[PDB]
Ligand binder design. Sequence first.
Ligand SMILES: *CCC(=O)N1CN(C(=O)CC*)CN(C(=O)CC*)C1
Ligand code: NA
Lengths: 15, 130
Amino acid sequence: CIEEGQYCFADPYLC
Amino acid sequence: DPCSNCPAGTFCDICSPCPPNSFSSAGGQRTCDICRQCKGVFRTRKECSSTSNAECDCTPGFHCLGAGCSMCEQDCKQGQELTKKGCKDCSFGTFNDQKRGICRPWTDCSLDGKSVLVDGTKERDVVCGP
Ligand SMILES: *CCC(=O)N1CN(C(=O)CC*)CN(C(=O)CC*)C1
Ligand code: NA
Protein backbone atom coordinates (compact mmCIF):
# COMPACT_ATOMS: atom_id res chain seq x y z
CA CYS A 1 0.00 0.00 0.00
CA ILE A 2 1.19 3.57 -0.61
CA GLU A 3 -0.27 6.87 0.63
CA GLU A 4 -2.94 8.65 -1.36
CA GLY A 5 -1.16 11.03 -3.80
CA GLN A 6 0.03 11.34 -7.44
CA TYR A 7 0.58 7.50 -7.55
CA CYS A 8 -2.67 6.37 -5.82
CA PHE A 9 -6.15 8.06 -5.92
CA ALA A 10 -8.98 7.55 -3.38
CA ASP A 11 -12.65 7.83 -4.53
CA PRO A 12 -14.04 9.59 -1.43
CA TYR A 13 -17.57 8.21 -2.19
CA LEU A 14 -16.00 4.85 -1.35
CA CYS A 15 -13.27 5.96 1.05
CA ASP B 1 -46.30 0.28 5.52
CA PRO B 2 -48.09 2.64 3.04
CA CYS B 3 -44.56 3.09 1.54
CA SER B 4 -43.71 -0.65 1.20
CA ASN B 5 -45.41 -0.50 -2.26
CA CYS B 6 -43.26 2.50 -3.41
CA PRO B 7 -40.98 0.28 -5.57
CA ALA B 8 -37.22 0.39 -6.36
CA GLY B 9 -36.68 3.56 -8.49
CA THR B 10 -38.72 5.65 -6.02
CA PHE B 11 -38.97 6.90 -2.42
CA CYS B 12 -41.92 7.83 -0.12
CA ASP B 13 -43.06 11.22 1.55
CA ILE B 14 -46.13 10.40 -2.24
CA CYS B 15 -43.99 7.72 -4.16
CA SER B 16 -41.86 10.36 -6.04
CA PRO B 17 -39.39 8.53 -8.37
CA CYS B 18 -35.61 9.06 -7.66
CA PRO B 19 -34.20 12.50 -8.54
CA PRO B 20 -31.49 12.83 -11.22
CA ASN B 21 -28.13 11.20 -10.25
CA SER B 22 -29.92 9.22 -7.46
CA PHE B 23 -31.05 5.52 -7.18
CA SER B 24 -33.04 3.19 -4.84
CA SER B 25 -31.92 -0.45 -4.81
CA ALA B 26 -35.12 -1.93 -3.20
CA GLY B 27 -38.80 -0.92 -2.68
CA GLY B 28 -39.92 0.69 0.65
CA GLN B 29 -37.18 3.38 0.85
CA ARG B 30 -37.86 6.78 2.51
CA THR B 31 -35.00 8.16 0.27
CA CYS B 32 -32.78 7.40 -2.84
CA ASP B 33 -28.92 7.30 -2.43
CA ILE B 34 -26.74 9.71 -4.49
CA CYS B 35 -24.92 7.92 -7.38
CA ARG B 36 -21.12 7.51 -7.16
CA GLN B 37 -19.59 9.58 -10.05
CA CYS B 38 -16.38 8.34 -11.78
CA LYS B 39 -14.05 11.42 -11.94
CA GLY B 40 -10.36 12.00 -12.81
CA VAL B 41 -8.56 8.65 -13.05
CA PHE B 42 -11.78 6.68 -12.34
CA ARG B 43 -13.54 5.65 -15.59
CA THR B 44 -17.27 4.69 -15.78
CA ARG B 45 -17.72 0.85 -16.10
CA LYS B 46 -21.55 0.96 -15.55
CA GLU B 47 -23.69 4.19 -15.66
CA CYS B 48 -25.93 4.97 -12.62
CA SER B 49 -29.60 3.76 -13.04
CA SER B 50 -32.72 4.50 -10.86
CA THR B 51 -32.18 1.13 -9.10
CA SER B 52 -28.31 0.53 -9.41
CA ASN B 53 -25.22 2.60 -8.46
CA ALA B 54 -22.57 3.70 -10.99
CA GLU B 55 -19.49 1.38 -11.14
CA CYS B 56 -15.94 2.73 -11.79
CA ASP B 57 -12.69 1.02 -12.98
CA CYS B 58 -9.38 2.99 -13.75
CA THR B 59 -7.91 4.66 -16.95
CA PRO B 60 -5.13 2.60 -18.61
CA GLY B 61 -1.79 2.90 -16.67
CA PHE B 62 -3.71 2.49 -13.34
CA HIS B 63 -5.46 -0.55 -11.70
CA CYS B 64 -8.23 -0.95 -9.06
CA LEU B 65 -7.70 -1.38 -5.32
CA GLY B 66 -10.39 -1.87 -2.63
CA ALA B 67 -13.93 -3.29 -2.53
CA GLY B 68 -15.65 -1.95 -5.69
CA CYS B 69 -12.51 -0.22 -6.95
CA SER B 70 -12.40 2.57 -4.28
CA MET B 71 -8.79 3.48 -5.47
CA CYS B 72 -6.74 3.70 -8.71
CA GLU B 73 -3.06 2.75 -8.15
CA GLN B 74 -0.47 3.47 -10.85
CA ASP B 75 0.86 0.38 -12.71
CA CYS B 76 4.60 -0.45 -12.87
CA LYS B 77 6.53 -2.95 -15.09
CA GLN B 78 7.47 -6.55 -14.19
CA GLY B 79 10.78 -6.13 -12.26
CA GLN B 80 9.51 -3.01 -10.46
CA GLU B 81 7.43 -2.13 -7.40
CA LEU B 82 5.40 1.06 -6.81
CA THR B 83 6.62 3.34 -3.95
CA LYS B 84 5.55 6.71 -2.44
CA LYS B 85 8.18 8.04 -4.95
CA GLY B 86 7.02 6.02 -8.01
CA CYS B 87 8.05 2.81 -9.81
CA LYS B 88 11.48 1.51 -8.53
CA ASP B 89 13.34 -1.49 -10.08
CA CYS B 90 13.42 -4.57 -7.75
CA SER B 91 16.69 -4.71 -5.68
CA PHE B 92 19.00 -7.68 -6.50
CA GLY B 93 17.61 -10.78 -4.70
CA THR B 94 13.97 -9.72 -5.32
CA PHE B 95 11.46 -10.16 -8.22
CA ASN B 96 7.98 -8.97 -9.29
CA ASP B 97 6.14 -10.92 -12.12
CA GLN B 98 3.02 -8.50 -12.06
CA LYS B 99 2.45 -4.74 -12.94
CA ARG B 100 1.38 -4.30 -9.29
CA GLY B 101 2.43 -5.24 -5.75
CA ILE B 102 5.98 -5.44 -4.23
CA CYS B 103 9.26 -7.13 -5.15
CA ARG B 104 9.37 -10.41 -3.18
CA PRO B 105 12.64 -12.15 -2.18
CA TRP B 106 13.74 -15.14 -4.33
CA THR B 107 13.14 -18.59 -2.84
CA ASP B 108 16.02 -19.89 -0.63
CA CYS B 109 16.65 -23.39 -2.13
CA SER B 110 19.34 -24.13 0.59
CA LEU B 111 16.69 -23.92 3.33
CA ASP B 112 14.66 -26.81 1.77
CA GLY B 113 18.02 -28.59 1.22
CA LYS B 114 18.15 -27.94 -2.60
CA SER B 115 20.38 -26.19 -5.18
CA VAL B 116 19.32 -23.27 -7.44
CA LEU B 117 18.36 -25.19 -10.65
CA VAL B 118 17.84 -21.79 -12.40
CA ASP B 119 19.01 -18.29 -11.29
CA GLY B 120 16.27 -15.69 -10.64
CA THR B 121 15.79 -12.27 -12.30
CA LYS B 122 13.96 -9.03 -11.40
CA GLU B 123 10.81 -10.69 -13.03
CA ARG B 124 11.17 -14.42 -12.10
CA ASP B 125 11.88 -16.41 -8.93
CA VAL B 126 14.82 -18.88 -8.87
CA VAL B 127 13.87 -22.58 -9.42
CA CYS B 128 15.28 -25.20 -6.96
CA GLY B 129 16.46 -28.78 -7.93
CA PRO B 130 15.38 -31.57 -5.45
C1 LIG C 1 -3.26 -0.02 -0.01
C2 LIG C 1 -3.97 1.32 -0.13
C3 LIG C 1 -4.91 1.60 1.02
O1 LIG C 1 -5.60 0.69 1.44
N1 LIG C 1 -5.01 2.85 1.52
C4 LIG C 1 -4.31 4.06 1.08
N2 LIG C 1 -5.30 4.97 0.49
C5 LIG C 1 -5.36 5.31 -0.82
O2 LIG C 1 -6.22 6.07 -1.23
C6 LIG C 1 -4.36 4.71 -1.76
C7 LIG C 1 -4.53 5.13 -3.21
C8 LIG C 1 -6.30 5.40 1.46
N3 LIG C 1 -6.95 4.15 1.83
C9 LIG C 1 -8.18 3.75 1.47
O3 LIG C 1 -8.54 2.61 1.76
C10 LIG C 1 -9.05 4.71 0.68
C11 LIG C 1 -10.33 4.18 0.04
C12 LIG C 1 -6.00 3.26 2.52
NA1 NA D 1 -25.97 -1.23 -6.64
